[PDB]
Amino acid sequence: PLDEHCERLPYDASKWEFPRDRLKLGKPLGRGAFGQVIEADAFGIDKTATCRTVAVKMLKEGATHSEHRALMSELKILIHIGHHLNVVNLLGACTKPGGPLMVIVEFCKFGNLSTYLRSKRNEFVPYKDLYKDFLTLEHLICYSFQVAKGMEFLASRKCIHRDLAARNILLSEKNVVKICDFGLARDIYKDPDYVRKGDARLPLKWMAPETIFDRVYTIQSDVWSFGVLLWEIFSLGASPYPGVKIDEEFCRRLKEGTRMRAPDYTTPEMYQTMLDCWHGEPSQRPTFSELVEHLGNLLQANA
Ligand SMILES: Cc1cc(C(=O)Nc2cccc(Oc3ccc4nc(NC(=O)C5CC5)cn4n3)c2)n(C)n1
């Protein structure tokens, strides 16, 4: 993957630089130790003379030059990745001296998918006036399909995600979901999804065994995380491994082949897809291209 050597990638200011005076900063959408994402109104960022609500990642009190460098690398990799319906897309950046580095991307109205799905437990029917804004199996399979599409796209750009999870999937209008990476804008030392392992705070419940045990990150470890994301979707935003202490024993049992049981809203095919994504052998997990085909088929079969 090339997303490990981002520093060599271009930042074409003539294309991407957006004047700070055309950006009206609003309320925070999330804050971490060193970073934050702010809602903003950007004047003419993507359509002439048109105000657009955007999401702006920038640093905050606590951040150092190290985080600034990291955010610049994120900007460069976003340019490299480019645009897809199912990825949060870069719209512009403010990089000029005299103000903070700001990475400006599409704003997703409904925010993170885990929180959203958890808010819809009382507004779900597998199939359907009364149920106008209800989620259905079609929605859940559709979100799954879309994330697979976005990951297939990221893979085509020779990138890997490394923190795939429902908290990093954002819901926009018209049931479009987008892969994001909140990164420094999340407080990982305070977020229970990130567990202390050594001197790192890691998303253990989403990590493939080879990642946990061997520090190996590949597109196939993202497929494992995608299986966990599927479980999150088909549990309507439940936390993975309910009633399991996330410790050395968990990791051992996981490596041994123990897996989550089927969540409440799954279809049998979807649960089997989860199990497939959780193959112990990375090369035996489906690829995102295969998942795209498969989920497209399940989405159609639902219709
Ligand atoms: C590498 C790499 C990095 C990224 C990346 O995504 N960077 C990124 C950049 C800027 C903001 C950001 O986070 C966002 C983005 C859109 C958004 N919309 C909401 N909406 C809400 O909160 C709603 C009120 C509920 C919240 N955000 N936060 C993520 N990628 C894809 N790859």
Side-chain angles (χ1 to χ4, degrees):
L2 58 88
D3 59 355
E4 290 293 63
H5 288 64
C6 295
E7 300 87 357
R8 79 194 203 287
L9 295 172
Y11 175 67
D12 178 3
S14 75
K15 174 171 172 182
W16 293 105
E17 191 73 21
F18 190 63
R20 289 211 188 68
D21 72 355
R22 296 188 210 163
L23 194 64
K24 167 156 50 178
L25 299 180
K27 302 293 177 180
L29 295 174
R31 306 186 94 222
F34 309 124
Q36 56 189 332
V37 173
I38 311 296
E39 192 173 330
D41 292 332
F43 192 77
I45 194 163
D46 59 15
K47 183 172 177 186
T48 305
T50 301
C51 194
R52 186 179 169 148
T53 302
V54 297
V56 181
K57 188 180 283 183
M58 62 179 282
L59 301 174
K60 61 170 278 296
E61 171 64 30
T64 71
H65 292 104
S66 184
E67 287 72 35
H68 180 97
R69 284 191 292 269
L71 184 58
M72 189 65 213
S73 279
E74 171 173 340
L75 174 53
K76 291 170 172 173
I77 200 70
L78 283 170
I79 294 166
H80 168 78
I81 289 161
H83 57 273
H84 186 273
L85 181 69
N86 302 122
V87 183
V88 161
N89 302 308
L90 185 68
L91 301 176
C94 308
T95 70
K96 283 192 179 165
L101 178 55
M102 294 172 159
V103 175
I104 310 161
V105 307
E106 300 172 315
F107 172 73
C108 298
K109 191 182 181 301
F110 296 98
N112 95 80
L113 191 59
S114 178
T115 306
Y116 177 77
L117 296 178
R118 248 228 139 279
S119 81
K120 303 290 282 183
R121 301 266 180 99
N122 191 225
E123 293 176 351
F124 174 85
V125 292
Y127 300 98
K128 56 165 171 165
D129 181 282
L130 281 151
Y131 315 120
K132 182 179 67 205
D133 298 312
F134 273 46
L135 295 179
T136 65
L137 265 175
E138 188 181 7
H139 290 84
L140 303 186
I141 302 168
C142 186
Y143 299 152
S144 302
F145 172 66
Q146 288 183 70
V147 175
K149 290 283 280 187
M151 285 305 302
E152 175 189 46
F153 175 76
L154 288 178
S156 79
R157 307 303 303 141
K158 307 295 176 57
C159 290
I160 71 170
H161 192 287
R162 306 183 181 79
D163 196 8
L164 188 57
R167 62 179 173 277
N168 275 328
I169 303 303
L170 305 179
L171 175 66
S172 190
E173 304 190 66
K174 298 170 166 176
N175 289 115
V176 174
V177 291
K178 290 175 169 281
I179 297 163
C180 77
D181 189 345
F182 216 55
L184 295 172
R186 188 179 279 120
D187 191 358
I188 60 167
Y189 282 86
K190 181 151 190 171
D191 193 317
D193 287 348
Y194 299 78
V195 178
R196 203 199 180 180
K197 191 180 170 64
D199 208 270
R201 264 271 199 136
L202 302 173
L204 289 182
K205 292 196 299 192
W206 286 264
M207 290 161 67
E210 73 273 12
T211 307
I212 297 174
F213 286 94
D214 303 329
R215 323 170 197 180
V216 166
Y217 294 81
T218 70
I219 195 64
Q220 294 307 110
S221 61
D222 280 344
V223 168
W224 177 288
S225 304
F226 181 79
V228 185
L229 167 63
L230 291 179
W231 188 96
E232 291 183 278
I233 291 171
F234 290 86
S235 67
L236 291 182
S239 188
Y241 302 99
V244 180
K245 179 66 199 292
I246 304 304
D247 57 12
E248 184 192 320
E249 196 168 46
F250 162 80
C251 296
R252 183 197 59 94
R253 288 207 70 200
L254 194 75
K255 197 186 170 86
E256 282 183 353
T258 310
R259 301 293 182 258
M260 279 192 275
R261 282 187 162 244
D264 291 345
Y265 314 93
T266 193
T267 62
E269 296 83 10
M270 197 60 71
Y271 182 56
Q272 185 60 58
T273 299
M274 293 168 209
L275 295 180
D276 289 345
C277 289
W278 302 328
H279 203 288
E281 298 187 6
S283 65
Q284 284 298 287
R285 297 175 196 149
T287 63
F288 283 111
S289 294
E290 289 159 1
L291 286 165
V292 164
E293 176 180 36
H294 185 60
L295 295 168
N297 287 338
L298 299 183
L299 180 52
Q300 181 50 222
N302 196 253

